[PDB]
Structure formats: C-alpha cells, structure tokens
Amino acid sequence: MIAPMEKLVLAGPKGRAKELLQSLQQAGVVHLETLRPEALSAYQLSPEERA
Amino acid sequence: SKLEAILSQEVEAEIQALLQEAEAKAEAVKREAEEKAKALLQARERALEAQYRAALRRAESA
Numbered sequence: 001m002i003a004p005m006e007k008l009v010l011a012g013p014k015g016r017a018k019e020l021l022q023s024l025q026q027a028g029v030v031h032l033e034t035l036r037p038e039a040l041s042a043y044q045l046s047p048e049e050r051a
Numbered sequence: 052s053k054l055e056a057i058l059s060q061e062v063e064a065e066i067q068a069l070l071q072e073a074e075a076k077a078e079a080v081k082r083e084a085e086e087k088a089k090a091l092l093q094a095r096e097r098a099l100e101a102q103y104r105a106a107l108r109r110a111e112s113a
Binding site for chain 1: 054057058
C-alpha cells in the first residue's frame with residue numbers, strides 16, 4: 001500500500017543545525033526538501049567548508 | 052520563539068561586548084589625552100616659572 005509519508009519541518013540556530021544534520025544523516029529516515037522561497041536564505045555554508 | 056530570542060540575545064551580546072571593548076579603548080584614549088595634557092601643562096608651568104625667574108634676575112641686574 002501507499003504510506004503516509006509525513007512531512008517534517010525543523011528550525012533553530014546554525015551550529016545546532018550542523019549537529020542535527022549529522023544526526024539526521026545518522027538517522028537517515030527523512031528524504032530532503034528545499035523549501036527555499038519564503039523568507040529564507042540559501043545556506044551557502046563556507047568556502048572553507050567547501051575546501 | 053525560543054531560538055529567536057536566543058539569536059537576538061547572542062547578537063546583542065556580541066554587540067555589547069564589542070561596544071564595551073570600544074568604550075574601554077576610548078576611555079584609555081581619553082586618559083592618555085589627559086596625561087599628555089597634564090605633561091604639556093607641567094611643561095608650560097615650568098616655562099612660566101623659568102620666565103618669572105629670568106625676569107626677576109634681569110630686574111635685580113638692572
């Protein structure tokens with residue numbers, strides 16, 4: 001059958017978001033979504049992080 | 052929100068630490084200007100004392 005596939009939205013500060021990204025990568029049970037448009041930034045992290 | 056108030060408080064705390072450091076530097080600059088003004092006033096007072104001494108010496112010589 002088709003599953004429910006509930007949507008989840010999370011927010012907070014930046015370093016806690018990096019830790020929660022490590023968490024949700026360890027707990028990889030949620031597919032991602034952009035949702036960039038309404039009053040948000042792009043989260044271009046760092047060129048040092050890019051390096 | 053809770054994270055909203057935490058982020059606003061963190062930005063205000065960073066601005067307050069920067070303002071306190073800049074105000075400490077400005078008060079140090081004011082103290083240094085007061086010390087330089089005190090040294091200049093001491094130099095002018097020693098010059099006035101030497102001028103009065105030389106004037107009294109010239110008057111006694113005449």
